[PDB]
Amino acid sequence: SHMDRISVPPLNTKRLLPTRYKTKNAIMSILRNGEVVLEFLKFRPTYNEDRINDICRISDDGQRIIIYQPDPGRGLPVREQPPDLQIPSGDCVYNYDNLPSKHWKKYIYGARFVGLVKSKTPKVTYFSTLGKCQLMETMTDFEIRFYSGAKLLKTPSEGLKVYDRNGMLLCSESRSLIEHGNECFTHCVNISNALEVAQTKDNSCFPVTIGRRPI
Amino acid sequence: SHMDRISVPPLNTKRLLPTRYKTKNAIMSILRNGEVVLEFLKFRPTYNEDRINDICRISDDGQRIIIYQPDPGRGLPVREQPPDLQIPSGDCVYNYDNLPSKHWKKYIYGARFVGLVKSKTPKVTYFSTLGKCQLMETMTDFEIRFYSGAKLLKTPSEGLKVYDRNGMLLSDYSCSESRSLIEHGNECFTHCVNISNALEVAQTKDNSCFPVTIGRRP
């Protein structure tokens, strides 16, 4: 039933570069091979330090999941990268369509970490007459760094905002920058749609950069 | 472990009106009192029809959960309204934090149900110079019915979709017309959000500020 399948769509790390992000509760990595590794931490007085409590690896297309607890009861100490993957024993290998519900929260955490990185990864970059425009891989996040210094931000929750170089939210000059922002956004979206036509499995069309900073 | 918990926060039916969804495997209701009632169905040859196998009731702040399994094995005939049955024992009354994982699928299903309702419930309606914009209770589902006939939809689940005057989905924005629809989308969405934000200030427990409609059909 529609009740036995997780809420998020299967994640995927298309065009996302290696990155290692760390909160107080988790280390999360996108690896060179596109896989997502989540190392959830638990502080262990016994060792007086964070320990890797459990690990969730997710394939670059979101369909294959491995979830286990390393050395249960104590886990592993934190290193500069996630631990290597030991050959799976089977009962720690799940897939997207049958992932049990008790593991959905971890998977959703991965989807969200991937969402974040996608929201900061430029897919189309364009030099307008007024500023450097960047459409992110999410197709919704977008910003312009104006040569003057101002900045326009478009996000899925607030819409378009514009700021001065130090970050104060500016006002008829705003009407001008905002209008230019809409225009660039649409151009970048059109560039993106246009380029999918030339895309093949062997040859990519992104990330793309058009024009250059004037002088 | 913190990651070994239910995958949705507590639901809530704030400002949702009564409603009833029928799927092949459940009947889902939001009652007048704000309660969610999920009726799980299963076809039973012995009766030659679908029977209600079990039931899950969830309070309006998502904090109370009651699980029934009425007339076990046999179930109940489906009715057009959910009946408020006897609870076998106090063991069947849970709260959100202690709900056992064997019932998370049910709860999450309820929370999804509620999200569907919220995504179709207008919270801010604005009549612009170009269309009727509706920002929904989710704060992220947004649509404009342009007076000219175009339509623009915005959801977290599908990004942006824009339909020309002829009801055709646009694949790109080449003409001055399509580019103006996308632009109005952004401006009107920013405004409805600002309206939502500004109104909260006037909100109390005695008086509401939503749903709100600004202006009118030209």
Technique employed here was X-ray
Query: In chain A, what are the domain boundaries?
Result: 1-121, 122-215
The encoded tokens of residue B99 equal: 């709900």
How big is the CA angle at A153 (ends A151 and A158), to the nearest 5 degrees?
145
B189: nearest CA partner in chain A: A159
How big is the CA angle at B26 (ends A105 and B42), to the nearest 5 degrees?
110
Decide if B2 contacts B13 (C-beta within 8 A): no
Which stretches of chain B sit within 8 Å of chain A by CB? 1-8, 23-26, 101, 104-106, 108-109, 112, 139-140, 156, 159-160, 171-174, 179, 182-183, 186-187, 189-190, 193
* Residue B37, beta-bridge partner list: B29, B57
3-class secondary-structure state, position B106: helix
Comparing C-alpha atoms, which of A50, A37, A120 is closest to residue A29?
Answer: A37
Centre a 10 Å sphere on the Cβ of residue A21 and count the other Cβ atoms it contains: 12
Distance between A109 CA and the closest CA of chain B, angstroms: 9
Which residue do the tokens 């405004």 mark? B191
Assigned fold of A1-121:
Arylsulfatase, C-terminal domain (3.30.1120)
Distance between B218 CA and the closest CA of chain A, angstroms: 25
The whole-angstrom separation of Cα B161 and Cα A110 is 26
The whole-angstrom separation of Cα A204 and Cα A212 is 21
Decide if A78 contacts A50 (C-beta within 8 A): yes
Among B1, B3, B161, which would you mutate to test the A interface (most chain A Cβ atoms within 10 Å of its Cβ)? B3
Does B122-218 match B1-121 at the fold level?
yes
The whole-angstrom separation of Cα A61 and Cα A118 is 14
* Residue A151, burial from CB neighbour count under 10 angstroms (0-12, 13-18, 19+): buried
A190: nearest CA partner in chain B: B172
The encoded tokens of residue A31 equal: 């690896």
From edge to edge, which strands make up the β-sheet containing B122-127? B159-163, B151-155, B142-146, B131-136, B122-127, B212-214
How big is the CA angle at B109 (ends B24 and B101), to the nearest 5 degrees?
125
Start-end of H helices in A55-172: 104-118
Kindly state the DSSP code that residue B19 receives in the 8-state scheme. E
B178: nearest CA partner in chain A: A186
Pick the CATH number of A122-215 from 2.60.40.10, 1.20.1440.20, 3.30.2270.10, 3.30.1120.130: 3.30.1120.130
* Residue A43, beta-bridge partner list: A50
Strands B49-58 and B64-68 turn out to be antiparallel
Comparing C-alpha atoms, which of A67, A43, A73, A71 is closest to residue A55?
Answer: A67
The encoded tokens of residue A22 equal: 């760390």
* Residue B94, beta-bridge partner list: B65
The whole-angstrom separation of Cα A180 and Cα A144 is 9
The whole-angstrom separation of Cα A215 and Cα B19 is 61
The whole-angstrom separation of Cα A85 and Cα B80 is 53
For this entry, resolution in Å reads 2.3
| Backbone phi, psi, residue A173, to 5° | -60, -30
Comparing C-alpha atoms, which of A6, A115, A190 is closest to residue B156?
Answer: A115
3-class secondary-structure state, position A177: helix
Tell me how far CA of residue A194 lies from CA of A129, A178, B171, B186, in angstroms.
21, 24, 10, 22
The whole-angstrom separation of Cα B90 and Cα A138 is 47
Give, rounded to a whole angstrom, the gap between the first and last alpha carbons of chain B. 56
Whether residue B186 and residue A189 make contact (CB cut-off 8 A), yes or no, is: no
Pick the CATH number of B122-218 from 3.30.1120.130, 3.40.30.10, 2.130.10.10, 3.40.50.1240: 3.30.1120.130
Whether residue A160 and residue B187 make contact (CB cut-off 8 A), yes or no, is: yes
Comparing C-alpha atoms, which of A37, A40, A35, A38 is closest to residue A12?
Answer: A35
Decide if B140 contacts B155 (C-beta within 8 A): yes
3-class secondary-structure state, position A63: coil
Which among B7, B26, B172 has CB closest to A104?
B7
B135: nearest CA partner in chain A: A157
Extended beta strands in chain B, E state:
19-22, 26-30, 36-44, 49-58, 64-68, 76-77, 93-95, 122-127, 131-136, 142-146, 151-155, 159-163, 212-214
| Backbone phi, psi, residue A205, to 5° | -125, 0
| CA dihedral (B82, B88, B89, B93) positive or negative | negative
State how far Cα A79 lies from the chain centre.
Answer: 23
Decide if B163 contacts B182 (C-beta within 8 A): no
* Residue B87, burial from CB neighbour count under 10 angstroms (0-12, 13-18, 19+): middle
Whether residue A160 and residue B8 make contact (CB cut-off 8 A), yes or no, is: no
